[PDB]
Design an enzyme around this catalytic site. Structure first.
Site, PDB file in Angstrom:
ATOM      1  N   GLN B  33       0.810  -1.228  -0.072  1.00 45.90           N
ATOM      2  CA  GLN B  33       0.152   0.151  -0.074  1.00 45.90           C
ATOM      3  C   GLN B  33       0.870   1.045   0.027  1.00 45.90           C
ATOM      4  O   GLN B  33       1.986   1.186   0.064  1.00 45.90           O
ATOM      5  CB  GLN B  33      -0.894   0.147   1.157  1.00 45.90           C
ATOM      6  CG  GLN B  33      -0.490  -0.520   2.444  1.00 45.90           C
ATOM      7  CD  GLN B  33      -1.545  -0.841   3.672  1.00 45.90           C
ATOM      8  OE1 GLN B  33      -2.645  -0.067   3.684  1.00 45.90           O
ATOM      9  NE2 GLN B  33      -1.284  -1.309   4.732  1.00 45.90           N
ATOM     10  N   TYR B  66      -9.095   5.588  19.096  1.00 48.55           N
ATOM     11  CA  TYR B  66      -9.219   4.250  18.412  1.00 48.55           C
ATOM     12  C   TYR B  66      -8.468   2.984  19.038  1.00 48.55           C
ATOM     13  O   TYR B  66      -9.100   2.244  19.121  1.00 48.55           O
ATOM     14  CB  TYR B  66      -8.575   4.512  17.075  1.00 48.55           C
ATOM     15  CG  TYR B  66      -8.638   3.316  15.804  1.00 48.55           C
ATOM     16  CD1 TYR B  66     -10.205   3.175  15.345  1.00 48.55           C
ATOM     17  CD2 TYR B  66      -7.749   2.483  15.783  1.00 48.55           C
ATOM     18  CE1 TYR B  66     -10.216   1.959  14.532  1.00 48.55           C
ATOM     19  CE2 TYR B  66      -7.764   1.238  15.004  1.00 48.55           C
ATOM     20  CZ  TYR B  66      -9.235   1.147  14.137  1.00 48.55           C
ATOM     21  OH  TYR B  66      -9.031  -0.040  13.481  1.00 48.55           O
ATOM     22  N   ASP B  91       1.201  -0.606  13.568  1.00 47.84           N
ATOM     23  CA  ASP B  91       1.623   0.574  14.488  1.00 47.84           C
ATOM     24  C   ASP B  91       2.090   0.257  15.894  1.00 47.84           C
ATOM     25  O   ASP B  91       2.746   1.018  16.493  1.00 47.84           O
ATOM     26  CB  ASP B  91       1.116   1.780  14.264  1.00 47.84           C
ATOM     27  CG  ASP B  91      -0.591   1.515  14.554  1.00 47.84           C
ATOM     28  OD1 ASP B  91      -0.841   0.825  15.448  1.00 47.84           O
ATOM     29  OD2 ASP B  91      -1.490   2.319  13.995  1.00 47.84           O
ATOM     30  N   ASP B 142       0.934 -13.446   6.416  1.00 45.11           N
ATOM     31  CA  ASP B 142      -0.608 -13.281   6.148  1.00 45.11           C
ATOM     32  C   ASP B 142      -1.526 -13.853   7.433  1.00 45.11           C
ATOM     33  O   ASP B 142      -1.200 -14.701   7.994  1.00 45.11           O
ATOM     34  CB  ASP B 142      -0.798 -14.210   4.967  1.00 45.11           C
ATOM     35  CG  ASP B 142      -2.186 -14.236   4.519  1.00 45.11           C
ATOM     36  OD1 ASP B 142      -2.890 -13.187   4.705  1.00 45.11           O
ATOM     37  OD2 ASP B 142      -2.518 -15.365   3.588  1.00 45.11           O
ATOM     38  N   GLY B 143      -2.456 -12.833   7.654  1.00 50.94           N
ATOM     39  CA  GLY B 143      -3.431 -13.381   8.917  1.00 50.94           C
ATOM     40  C   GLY B 143      -4.075 -14.327   8.472  1.00 50.94           C
ATOM     41  O   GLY B 143      -4.777 -15.004   9.362  1.00 50.94           O
ATOM     42  N   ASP B 161      -7.798  -5.295  13.604  1.00 49.03           N
ATOM     43  CA  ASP B 161      -7.578  -4.003  13.198  1.00 49.03           C
ATOM     44  C   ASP B 161      -7.366  -3.725  11.572  1.00 49.03           C
ATOM     45  O   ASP B 161      -6.161  -3.358  11.355  1.00 49.03           O
ATOM     46  CB  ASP B 161      -6.379  -3.424  14.196  1.00 49.03           C
ATOM     47  CG  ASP B 161      -6.115  -1.988  13.990  1.00 49.03           C
ATOM     48  OD1 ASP B 161      -7.115  -1.251  13.203  1.00 49.03           O
ATOM     49  OD2 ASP B 161      -5.126  -1.665  14.485  1.00 49.03           O
ATOM     50  N   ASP B 164      -9.217  -5.612   5.408  1.00 50.70           N
ATOM     51  CA  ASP B 164      -8.639  -6.421   4.705  1.00 50.70           C
ATOM     52  C   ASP B 164      -7.367  -6.599   3.909  1.00 50.70           C
ATOM     53  O   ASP B 164      -7.153  -7.241   2.846  1.00 50.70           O
ATOM     54  CB  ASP B 164      -9.805  -7.378   3.583  1.00 50.70           C
ATOM     55  CG  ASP B 164      -9.617  -8.857   3.426  1.00 50.70           C
ATOM     56  OD1 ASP B 164      -9.183  -9.363   4.380  1.00 50.70           O
ATOM     57  OD2 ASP B 164      -9.788  -9.071   2.364  1.00 50.70           O
ATOM     58  N   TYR B 226     -11.033  11.087  11.303  1.00 51.90           N
ATOM     59  CA  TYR B 226     -11.830  10.602  10.099  1.00 51.90           C
ATOM     60  C   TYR B 226     -12.573  11.418   9.321  1.00 51.90           C
ATOM     61  O   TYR B 226     -13.532  12.127   9.951  1.00 51.90           O
ATOM     62  CB  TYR B 226     -12.706   9.246  10.911  1.00 51.90           C
ATOM     63  CG  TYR B 226     -13.026   7.899  10.115  1.00 51.90           C
ATOM     64  CD1 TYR B 226     -11.994   7.162   9.896  1.00 51.90           C
ATOM     65  CD2 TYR B 226     -14.507   7.882   9.624  1.00 51.90           C
ATOM     66  CE1 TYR B 226     -12.360   5.890   8.920  1.00 51.90           C
ATOM     67  CE2 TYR B 226     -14.595   6.954   8.619  1.00 51.90           C
ATOM     68  CZ  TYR B 226     -13.592   5.907   8.463  1.00 51.90           C
ATOM     69  OH  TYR B 226     -13.884   4.906   7.629  1.00 51.90           O
TER      70      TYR B 226
END
Lengths: 288, 283
Positions: B33, B66, B91, B142-143, B161, B164, B226
């Site tokens: 990303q 958050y 993070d 990979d989750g 968290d 996707d 947000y």
């Protein structure tokens, strides 16, 4: 002069140094100064959900999409906190949004509304009919004029509720005399609702304003938080104040569920009423 | 470009929000990303800002909302959370809040983007300090692969968290998450805004219920950065009849309670009260 079809509106405000929010303009309906402020009405992107938007002094006031939040919270949180609100005063509220919500209550026999800018009312009448419909209600007497002069000439114990939907056009320039007037024109069980600032951008002002209204003579003042997407940080608030020592405005005195228009409301209900007075820890001292 | 970051429209076009940039610390794609870190206007209170895929994720100013809501709303709803899994949370913000709890013996964290956590380590130390905690096992990978290879009844709490990102695969994934949770397990999932995608929250909510969770409840929160100013989290309970809207273990009894900046049992209960137009999510 600024806005143009296909261009973007930009809310900047110096309250926030180095931040701004923008909306794409489809059609400008009004853009010019009035007697007291800069009015700007336009139609937003049809692909977006905001619809017709209004900005006063470069700050978005009303949009078709989220308009109901601010109007319901002011109107109902204060009225549902009073044991029997028969006579109501709204200082500001020119667009008629808070008036519309106060007039839902069967107990309200009459409501006086005093806003200074008549051109804002006229443009609301044209472009926001769903909001301004209530300006013509037989129980509403709408006045264009000075709210300071009005409240000073109003006798004692005249009103059950006084809603101040304005930040002035930090008791500066006219607070001391005005809030003393507001306290005296309220009946012993009177509730006073005052629009508050954001807990993110000006917590210091909320604290001062809260302490000032208590020093004035109000027995209690409590800050109700709300979700308004169009506000800079996304959360404005309101100070709900009691003259009577003892009443706890954080729990509805007359729950809206016991009256027939409860299901017409888009935002407010009794559970939101209670929830609005729970503030984050960093802001919690405001409500003690 | 000219000293201003501008947040993406993407879904629902016409809206945009902008922040004045003082100094760019990082701006470039990664393996998965577009990462963007910069220092905001010193006159403004936001401090260092991070954006993923043109969307503000973390800022020094509001970051605590958050992370406290996800970390504590889920843990305080569990009777005794000893083992925790965090999918995403690169993070380290949610990890830092989970690790406050004395009952947590171990916490596994699986995020796919390793560059994001390296940049958090550099520019957000107050957030990413917890990645090095002895009770945290941090994994880059990979989750979906991890949860399918995790045995049954391993976790007390699973915090998702993420919406996707790793290159669609909900059906298998949420079945896995349900299975790897112990019978009294809680699952916390980040939700969308009630303003811009209520339809998605409703679908997501029904889907998790259909998957096997006995209850799903949406917790609302005040996050200024947000787009609309109010994201939320879905709190999901495997065991039936669980009313997660009242804290099971009040944070006020724990010693770190006064160190929190947002969350407390009052905010917990208020969070599940939704505007009427969106109340059908929790009913």
């Amino acid at each position: 002069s600024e806005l143009i079809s296909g261009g973007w509106f930009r809310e900047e405000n110096d309250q926030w140094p180095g931040q701004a929010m923008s909306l794409r303009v489809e059609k400008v309906l009004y853009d010019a100064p009035t007697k007291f402020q800069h009015l700007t009405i336009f139609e937003s992107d049809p692909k977006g959900p905001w619809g017709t938007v209004m900005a006063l002094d470069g700050c978005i006031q009303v949009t078709d999409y989220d308009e109901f939040v601010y109007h319901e919270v002011l109107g109902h949180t204060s009225l549902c906190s009073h044991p029997k609100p028969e006579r109501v005063l709204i200082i500001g509220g020119g667009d008629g949004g808070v008036l519309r919500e106060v007039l839902r209550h069967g107990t309200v026999e009459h409501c006086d509304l005093v806003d200074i800018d008549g051109e804002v009312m006229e443009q609301s009448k044209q472009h926001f009919p769903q909001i301004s419909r209530s300006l013509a209600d037989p129980r509403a007497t709408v006045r264009v004029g000075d709210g300071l002069a009005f409240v000073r000439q109003t006798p004692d114990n005249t009103y059950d509720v006084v809603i101040i939907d304005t930040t002035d056009p930090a008791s500066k320039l006219f607070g001391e005399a005005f809030y003393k007037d507001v306290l005296r024109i309220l009946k012993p069980d009177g509730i006073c609702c005052n629009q508050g600032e954001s807990i993110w951008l000006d917590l210091e002002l909320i604290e001062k304003m809260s302490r000032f209204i208590r020093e004035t003579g109000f027995a209690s003042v409590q800050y109700a938080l709300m979700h308004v997407p169009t506000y800079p940080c996304g959360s404005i608030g309101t100070l709900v104040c009691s003259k009577k020592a003892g009443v706890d405005v954080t729990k509805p005195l007359r729950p809206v569920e016991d009256m027939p228009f409860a299901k017409d409301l888009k935002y407010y209900d009794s559970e939101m009423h209670k929830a609005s007075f729970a503030l984050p820890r960093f802001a919690r001292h405001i409500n003690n």
